Design a protein around this ligand. Structure first.
Ligand code: CHL
Ligand code: CHL
Ligand code: CHL
Ligand SMILES: CCCCCCCCCCCCCCCCCC(=O)OC[C@H](CO[C@@H]1O[C@H](CO[C@H]2O[C@H](CO)[C@H](O)[C@H](O)[C@H]2O)[C@H](O)[C@H](O)[C@H]1O)OC(=O)CCCCCCCCCCCCCCCCC
Ligand code: CLA
Ligand code: CLA
Ligand code: CLA
Ligand code: CLA
Ligand SMILES: CCCCCCCCCCCCCCCCCC(=O)OC[C@H](CO[C@@H]1O[C@H](CO)[C@H](O)[C@H](O)[C@H]1O)OC(=O)CCCCCCCCCCCCCCCCC
Ligand SMILES: CC1=C[C@H](O)CC(C)(C)[C@H]1/C=C/C(C)=C/C=C/C(C)=C/C=C/C=C(C)/C=C/C=C(C)/C=C/C1=C(C)C[C@H](O)CC1(C)C
Lengths: 125, 219, 50, 35, 56, 219, 220
C-alpha cells in the first residue's frame, strides 16, 4: 500500500504527535492548563484524548475503556441520526414529496393506517 | 485463440502475410492490423496502446450516457432536453439543470462554476492516474487493480487476459458507435434512438442515402 | 459590507426619489471601466477623485 | 495647443520614470557604512 | 462658438488623456525607460539568494 | 539520372545542402523531400511508399473518370449528369442511371444492390492484394508482375525502373490534380471543364481569387 | 547545462503529477517540459525535424499575432485603414482604390493581386532556399540559430545567456501559437476582431463569453 498525497508529494499519516503521546492537544491551552494536572489515567493512548475530565468521572484505565465503548457507539449513532435528520427535511423543502418532513413529525405520519414515502436520492421516490 | 501466433486476425483466413512482424499477439486485442505502419517503434506502440485503452473506456461511458437519457425519456420521464447533443444547453434554461427532471436534485444554474469544479477535479484525478495518488503509486498504468478492483474479478491470469480482451473489444465497438453518433447527429439532426425508430419504421427509404445530396457543393 | 447592502436589509440611499430611504442594491456596478475610472480621475475641482 | 500638452506630458513622464527607476536601482546599498 | 477649446477640464478623463496620442506617449516613454533599466540591471547585482538585501 | 546520389531533387540548387540521410535514392521518385521526418524508420518508409503508390493509381483512375464524361457530354453525348460530383445522384433519378445515356445499358435503379456488390467484390480483391491469392502468392507487394503484366513491357530491369519512375511521377501529378478537383468543386461549384472554359474566356478577371470572400465568417 | 531550465531538475508540464518524463526527453533542449504523451518523437531524427518545425512555426506565429493585433488597434484609435480586421484585410485589394498602407493613397497603393502574388512567390522561394541551403548571408551556420549576420547586436555571445534567451524565445513562441489558434477559432465562431471580442468581454464578463455562442453550431 504505497500512496501519494492528495495534492502531490509524499502520502501517509502526516504527524501523529499532535493527538498521541505526552505532547498533544488539550481542551485548554498551554498557559491555562499545564501538563502536570492531566489525570494519570488520561495518557496519550486512546484516540481523541484531550485530557478532558472534570469531576473525575473516569477513575482508571479499564473504566475509561468501558466508557469509551459507550462514547464510540453513541458517536456513530449520532452521526447517522444527524444525517437522517438533516437530509430528508432539506429534500422535502426543495420540492420532493417526502411526506415525512421534519424529524419530530415523521413518527406520527405512520400512525393510523398511514404509510411513508422513501426517496432514493439518485433514482425515484 | 486471441493470443499467440494462431490468433484471430483482421482479415480472417486471408491474413497470414498481412500481419506485420512487430505485432506478435502479446497484447490484448492484437489482430495484427497496422497497414499504415504507425507503431513500428515499440515505445510509440506502447503509447498508442495506452491511448487506445483510455479512448475505449471514455467511449464506453459516453455511449452508455448517450443511450440512457433518451430511453428514459421515451419511458415517460420529463428531462427538459433528452437528446444527447442538445442536453448541454439546458443549463441556460430558467429552471436550470435537474437530474432526471426532479427539481430537488442538483438544480444547477451557473455554467462557469460547474466548469471550474470539473477542471479542478478532473485535473486532480488525471494527475493521480499519471503519477499515482491516494489509491496507490506503484501499479500498472493501465490496470492498477487493488483499490480499483474491489470485487476481485481479476485474480487468475488466464481469466484476467480474457477479461482484458473482452474490455478492448467492447471498447472498440463503443468507439465505432460513438463515431457513428457524431456523424449521425451532424447529418441527420435527431437523436440516435429517434434515428433507429425511423429506420425501423421504413428501412427501405429511411437510411443514410436519403441524405446523400445534403452536402452538395452546388453554388 | 456587500452582503449587508445586498441581502440583509439595505443601505440608506440618499438619492432615492423624494427623500432618501433604505434600499437594497440589487444591481451593483461591477463594470471594470466605471469602477477604475474613479481611481485614475484627477483630484482637482470638478473631478474630485474617489 | 495640444502640442504643448504632448510636450509637457512627455517631459513629466520622463522625469517621473527617472525617479521611479532610480530607487529601484539598489538604492539602499548606496550608503557609505560598513555592513 | 467664438474660438476653439480642448473642453476637458471637468470631464474627468482617465489620466487626463482625451487623445490616444497622449496614452501612446505615456506608454512609449515608460517602456523606453523600463527597457533601459532592464538592460542596465546587470550592473546592480543579482539578489538570487533567498536572504539578501539591506536588513536588520 | 533518377536512382543515384546525383539525382534531381525537390528544391533544385537549394536541396543538396540539406537532404535526409535515410533517403539514399534506391527507390523511384526519390526527390529527397522528407522535411517532416516521417519516414525515419525503414518499415514506416515502406508502408508510406505502399500507401503513396495505391493513392497514385486510384487517383489516376479517378482523374480519367472525372474528365471523360464531361468531355464526351461536351462533344454531344446525352449524359444524365456530366459533372463528376453530381454524377452519384443519377441512381435516384426516375429513369435510373444509364451508361452513356442509353437506357439499354446497365439501367441501374437501386443503390443498395450496387453498393453491396461493390463491397463484396472489392473486399475479396483487396484481401487478395493484401495477402496473396489466385493471381500469384509471395510476389512483390507493389509490382507483382506476372499475370498482372500480360504485355511484358517491363522485362528489361533498366526499362522496368524507368517505367516505375514514370508511373510514380504520373501518379503524383494525378493526385495533385484530384486534390485540385476536390477544392474547385468545393469552392466554385462547377465542373473542372467548365472551370477551364471560364478561365480561358477571361483569364485575368475570373480565377481563384474571384472566390476569395466566399468563406468569410458571418455575424 | 547547469540552469533551472535544463537537466533532470527542469520544470515539467504536469507539476508534481508529471512523474518521470520519457527517456528520450533527457532535457537538453529549450522548453523541454517532457510532454510527449503521444510518443511522436521516439526516433531522434523525427525529434530533430519536429524541433525545427516548432521553432519555425513559433517565429511565424509571433510575427502573425503582432501583425493581427497592431492594425486593428491603430484603426480603433482612428487611423483610416481600408479594413482593420485581421481576417478581412486581404479583401482590400478588391476595393476601387486598391490596398493603401496606413490608409494613405501614396503609400504602396497596390492595385493587382497577381503582381503581389508573383513577387511574394519569387522572394519567399529565394528566402526559404537560402534558409535551407546556405546563401549570401552565411553558408556554414546552424539551421535553426544561424547567428552571424542575423544577430547584429551580439545578444548571444554568452552561452548561458544564449540558453536563457533560447528558452525565452521558445516559450514566447508557444504562447503566440496558442494565441493564433485562438485567433482562428474566435474569428470562425464570433465573427469579430480579437480586440472587439476583448472589448465585449470587458463590457460584461458575466454574459459576453464563449458560452454565449455555444448554441451556434447545433444541427437542425
Ligand atoms: C430511538 C429514538 C427515538 C426518538 C428520540 C423519538 C422521538 C419521537 N418520537 Mg418516535 N422516537 C424514537 C424512536 C421511534 N419512534 C417510533 C415511532 C413513533 C410514532 C408513531 C410517533 C413517534 C413520536 C415521537 C415524538 C414524541 C414526542 C418524538 C419526536 C410521535 C410524534 O412524532 O408526534 C409528533 C408519534 O406519533 N415515534 C418508532 C417505531 C416504533 C421508533 C423506533 O425506535
Ligand atoms: C474474409 C473477409 C474479410 C475482409 C475483406 C475483412 C476486412 C476488414 N476487416 Mg476483418 N475482414 C474479413 C474477415 C474477418 N475480420 C475479422 C475481424 C476484424 C476486426 C476486429 C476488425 C476487422 C476490421 C476489418 C476492416 C479493416 C480495413 C478497414 O478498416 O477498411 C476500410 C475501408 C473500407 C471499409 C472500404 C470503403 C467502404 C466503401 C466501399 C466506400 C464507401 C464510399 C462512401 C460513400 C464515401 C462517401 C464519403 C465522401 C463524402 C468522402 C476491413 C473491412 C476492422 C474494422 O472493421 O474497422 C473499421 C476491425 O476492427 N476485422 C474476423 C474475425 C476473426 C474475420 C473472419 O473472417
Ligand atoms: C529552384 C527553385 C525551386 C523552388 C523554390 C522549389 C520549391 C518547391 N518544389 Mg521543387 N522547387 C524548385 C526547383 C525544382 N523542383 C524540382 C522538382 C520538384 C518535384 C517533383 C516536387 C517539387 C515540389 C516543390 C514544392 C515543395 C512543397 C513546399 O516546400 O511547400 C512550401 C511552398 C508553399 C507553401 C507555397 C505557398 C504559395 C503561396 C506563397 C502561399 C499561398 C497563399 C494562400 C493565398 C493562402 C490562403 C490561405 C487559405 C488556405 C485559407 C516547392 C514549391 C513538390 C510539390 O510540387 O508540392 C506541392 C514536388 O512534388 N519540386 C525540380 C526538378 C529537378 C527543380 C529544378 O530546379
Ligand atoms: C506608474 C503607474 C502607471 C499606471 C499603473 C500601471 C500598473 C502596471 C502594473 C504591472 C507592471 C508593474 C511594473 C512595476 C515596475 C517594476 C518592474 C520590475 O521590477 O521588473 C524587474 C523584473 C526583472 O526581470 C528579471 O531580470 C533578470 C536579469 O536579466 C538580465 O540577465 C539575464 C540573464 O541572467 C538576461 O541576459 C537578460 O537579458 C538581462 O537583462 C532576468 O532576465 C530574469 O529572467 C528577469 O525575470 O522584470 C520583470 O518583472 C518583468 C517585467 C514586468 C512588466 C514590465 C512591463 C513594462 C511595460 C511593457 C510594455 C512596454 C511597451 C513599450 C512600447 C514602446 C514602443 C511604442
Ligand atoms: C492577535 C490575536 C492573538 C494571537 C495571535 C494569539 C496567539 C496565541 N495565543 Mg492568545 N489570546 C487572544 C488573542 C490572540 N492570541 C485573545 C483575544 C485572548 C482572550 C480570549 C487570548 C487568550 C489566550 C490564552 C489564555 C492563551 C493564549 C495562547 C496563545 C498561543 C497558542 C494558543 C492560541 O492560538 O490561542 C488559542 C485561542 C483561542 C482558542 C481563542 C478562540 C479563537 C477562535 C479561533 C475564535 C476566532 C475569532 C475570529 C477568527 C476573529 C474575530 C474577529 C473579531 C470578532 C475580533 C498563541 C501564541 C496560549 C499560550 O500562549 O499559552 C502559553 C494560552 O494559554 N491566548
Ligand atoms: C439511524 C438513523 C436513521 C433512522 C432511524 C432513519 C429512519 C427513517 N428514514 Mg432516514 N436517513 C438516514 C438515517 C436514518 N433514517 C441517513 C443516514 C440518511 C442519509 C443517507 C437518511 C436519508 C433518508 C431519506 C432521504 C429519507 C429517509 C426516510 C426515513 C424513514 C423511512 C425509511 C425507509 O422506509 O427506508 C427503507 C429503506 C430500506 C433500505 C424512516 C423514518 C424517508 C422518509 O420518510 O423521510 C422522512 C426518506 O425519504 N431517510
Ligand atoms: C462520462 C460520461 C458521462 C457524462 C459526461 C455525462 C454527462 C451528463 N449526464 Mg449522463 N450518464 C452517464 C454518463 C455520462 N453523463 C451514464 C453512464 C449514465 C447511466 C447511469 C448516465 C445517466 C444520466 C441520466 C439519467 C441523466 C444524465 C444527465 C447528465 C447531465 C448532468 C450531469 C450531472 O449533473 O451529473 C452529476 C449528478 C450528480 C453528481 C448527482 C448524483 C448522480 C450520481 C453520480 C449518478 C451515478 C450513477 C451510477 C454511478 C451508475 C449507475 C448505477 C446503476 C447501474 C445502479 C450531463 C450532460 C442528466 C441530464 O441532464 O439529462 C440529460 C440526467 O438526467 N446522465
Ligand atoms: C497520401 C499520399 C502520399 C503518400 C503516402 C506519400 C508518401 C511519401 N512520399 Mg510522396 N507525394 C505525394 C503524396 C504522398 N506521398 C504528392 C501528392 C506529391 C506531389 C506534391 C508527392 C511528392 C513526393 C516527392 C517529390 C517525394 C515524395 C516522397 C515520399 C516519401 C517520404 C515523404 C513522407 O514521409 O511522406 C509521408 C506522407 C504522409 C504521412 C501523408 C500525410 C498527408 C497529410 C494528410 C497532408 C496531406 C494534405 C496536404 C496539406 C497537402 C498539401 C499539398 C496540396 C497542395 C496537394 C513517402 C513514401 C519522397 C521520397 O522519398 O520518395 C520515395 C520524395 O522525394 N513524395
Ligand atoms: C506629501 C503628501 C502627499 C499627500 C498625498 C495625498 C493623496 C493624494 C492622492 C492623489 C490621487 C492621484 C490619482 C491620479 C492622479 C492623476 O491621474 O492625474 C491626472 C491629472 C489630470 O490632468 C488633467 O486632467 C484634466 C481632466 O481630464 C484635463 O484632461 C487636463 O487636460 C489634464 O492635464 O494630471 C495631473 O494633475 C498631473 C499628474 C502628475 C503630477 C506629477 C506627479 C509626480 C509624482 C512623483 C512621484 C511618483 C511616485
Ligand atoms: C506538444 C504535443 C505533444 C503530444 O505528444 C502530441 C500533441 C498534443 C499533438 C502535441 C501538441 C501540439 C500542438 C498543441 C500544436 C499546436 C500548434 C499550433 C496551434 C500552431 C499554430 C500556428 C499558428 C501560426 C503559424 C500562425 C500564423 C499566422 C500568420 C502567418 C498570420 C498572417 C497574417 C497576418 C499577420 C494578419 C494579416 O491580416 C493576414 C495574414 C497574412 C493571415
Amino acid at each position: 500500500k504505497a500512496t501519494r498525497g492528495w495534492l502531490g508529494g509524499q502520502g501517509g499519516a502526516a504527524d501523529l504527535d499532535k493527538w498521541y503521546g505526552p505532547d498533544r492537544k488539550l481542551f485548554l491551552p498551554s498557559g491555562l492548563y499545564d501538563r502536570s494536572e492531566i489525570p494519570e489515567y488520561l495518557n496519550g493512548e486512546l484516540a481523541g484524548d484531550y485530557g478532558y475530565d472534570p469531576l473525575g468521572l473516569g477513575k482508571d484505565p479499564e473504566t475509561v475503556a468501558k466508557y469509551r465503548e459507550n462514547e464510540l457507539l453513541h458517536a456513530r449513532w449520532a452521526m447517522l441520526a444527524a444525517a437522517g435528520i438533516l437530509i430528508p427535511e432539506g429534500l422535502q423543502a426543495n420540492g420532493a414529496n417526502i411526506k415525512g418532513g421534519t424529524w419530530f413529525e415523521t413518527g406520527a405520519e405512520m400512525l393510523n393506517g398511514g404509510t411513508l414515502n422513501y426517496f432514493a436520492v439518485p433514482w425515484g421516490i | 485463440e486471441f493470443y499467440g501466433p494462431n490468433r484471430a486476425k483482421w482479415l480472417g483466413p486471408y491474413s497470414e502475410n498481412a500481419t506485420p512482424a512487430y505485432l506478435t499477439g502479446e497484447f490484448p486485442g492484437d489482430y495484427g492490423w497496422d497497414t499504415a505502419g504507425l507503431s513500428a517503434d515499440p515505445e510509440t506502440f506502447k503509447r498508442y496502446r495506452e491511448l487506445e485503452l483510455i479512448h475505449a473506456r471514455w467511449a464506453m461511458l459516453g455511449a452508455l450516457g448517450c443511450i440512457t437519457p433518451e430511453l428514459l425519456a421515451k419511458s415517460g420521464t420529463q428531462f427538459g432536453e433528452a437528446v444527447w447533443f442538445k442536453a448541454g444547453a439546458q443549463i441556460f434554461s430558467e429552471g436550470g439543470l435537474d437530474y432526471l427532471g426532479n427539481p430537488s436534485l442538483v438544480h444547477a444554474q451557473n455554467i462557469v462554476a460547474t466548469l471550474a469544479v470539473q477542471v479542478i477535479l478532473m485535473g486532480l484525478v488525471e494527475g493521480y492516474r499519471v503519477n499515482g495518488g491516494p489509491a496507490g503509486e506503484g501499479l500498472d498504468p493501465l490496470y492498477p487493480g487493488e483499490s480499483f478492483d474491489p470485487l476481485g474479478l481479476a485474480d487468475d491470469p488466464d481469466t484476467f487476459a480474457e477479461l482484458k480482451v473482452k474490455e478492448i473489444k467492447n471498447g472498440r465497438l463503443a468507439m465505432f458507435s460513438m463515431f457513428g453518433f457524431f456523424v449521425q447527429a451532424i447529418v441527420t439532426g435527431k437523436g440516435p434512438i429517434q434515428n433507429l425508430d425511423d429506420h425501423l419504421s421504413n428501412p427501405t427509404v429511411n437510411n443514410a442515402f436519403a441524405f446523400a445530396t445534403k452536402f452538395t457543393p452546388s453554388a | 459590507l456587500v452582503w449587508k447592502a445586498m441581502y440583509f436589509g439595505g443601505v440608506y440611499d440618499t438619492w432615492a426619489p423624494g427623500g432618501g430611504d433604505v434600499r437594497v442594491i440589487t444591481n451593483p456596478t461591477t463594470n471594470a471601466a466605471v469602477i477604475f475610472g474613479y481611481l485614475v480621475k484627477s483630484p482637482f475641482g470638478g473631478d474630485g477623485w474617489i | 495647443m495640444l502640442t504643448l500638452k504632448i510636450f509637457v506630458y512627455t517631459v513629466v513622464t520622463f522625469f517621473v520614470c527617472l525617479f521611479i527607476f532610480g530607487f529601484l536601482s539598489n538604492d539602499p546599498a548606496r550608503n557609505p557604512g560598513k555592513n | 462658438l467664438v474660438d476653439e477649446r480642448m473642453n476637458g477640464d471637468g470631464t474627468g478623463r482617465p489620466f487626463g488623456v482625451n487623445d490616444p496620442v497622449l496614452g501612446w506617449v505615456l506608454l512609449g516613454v515608460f517602456g523606453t525607460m523600463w527597457a533601459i533599466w532592464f538592460i542596465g540591471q546587470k550592473d546592480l547585482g543579482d539578489f538570487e539568494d533567498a536572504d539578501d538585501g539591506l536588513k536588520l
